[PDB]
């Protein structure tokens, strides 16, 4: 599923991401835009053999199991394929664990490089929220 911008904003808010760990809802929409372009089915391999999955590109080395990543930890205790569903519940629950770990949203390279320090609130403007 390719979410609309305001459509994904409403869903992330419904699942309690707005202001989660102090990160306003705009930070999460911006991150999804640049990690996956709002596409729940996005997958991208990394150099270390792991792969990033879903609308927030969660990694198979530590967080989910795709059965092909050596040293997998599956800390979110889910198959990575669950991160590609049209229902973002699984990606949201795992993202909550990631952002709580210690480095905050810096765990998302696209957020650090393209969202952090910008007008992230622009990513929810015009949305009926
Ligand atoms: Cl915001």
Swiss-Prot record:
The active site is at residues 35, 52. Transmembrane segments: none annotated. It catalyses: Hydrolysis of (1->4)-beta-linkages between N-acetylmuramic acid and N-acetyl-D-glucosamine residues in a peptidoglycan and between N-acetyl-D-glucosamine residues in chitodextrins. In the egg white and polymorphonuclear leukocytes. InterPro entries: Glyco_hydro_22, Glyco_hydro_22_CS, Glyco_hydro_22_lys, Lysozyme-like_dom_sf. Disulfide bonds join 6-127, 30-115, 64-80, 76-94. Substrate binds at residue 101. The keyword Disulfide bond applies. Keywords: Allergen, Antimicrobial, Bacteriolytic enzyme, Disulfide bond, Glycosidase, Hydrolase, Secreted, Signal. GO terms for cellular component: cytoplasm; endoplasmic reticulum; extracellular space. GO terms for biological process: cell wall macromolecule catabolic process; defense response to bacterium; defense response to Gram-negative bacterium; defense response to Gram-positive bacterium; killing of cells of another organism. Its main location: secreted. Residues 1-129 form the C-type lysozyme domain. Gene3D superfamilies: 1.10.530.10. Its EC number is 3.2.1.17. It is found in: Secreted. Belongs to the glycosyl hydrolase 22 family. Lysozymes have primarily a bacteriolytic function; those in tissues and body fluids are associated with the monocyte-macrophage system and enhance the activity of immunoagents. Has bacteriolytic activity against M.luteus. Lysozyme C is capable of both hydrolysis and transglycosylation; it also shows a slight esterase activity. It acts rapidly on both peptide-substituted and unsubstituted peptidoglycan, and slowly on chitin oligosaccharides. Monomer. This is Lysozyme C. It comes from Gallus gallus (Chicken). The gene is LYZ.
């Amino acid at each position: 599923k390719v979410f609309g911008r305001c459509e994904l904003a409403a869903a992330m808010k419904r699942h309690g991401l707005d202001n989660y760990r102090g990160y306003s809802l705009g930070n999460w929409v911006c991150a999804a835009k640049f990690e996956s372009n709002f596409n729940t089915q996005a997958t991208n391999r990394n150099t270390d053999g792991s792969t990033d999955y879903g609308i927030l590109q969660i990694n198979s080395r530590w967080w989910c199991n795709d059965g092909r990543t050596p040293g997998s930890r599956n800390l979110c205790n889910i198959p990575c394929s669950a991160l590609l569903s049209s229902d973002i519940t699984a990606s949201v629950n795992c993202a909550k664990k990631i952002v709580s770990d210690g480095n905050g949203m810096n765990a998302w390279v696209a957020w650090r490089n393209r969202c952090k320090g910008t007008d992230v609130q622009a990513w929810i403007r015009g949305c009926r929220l």
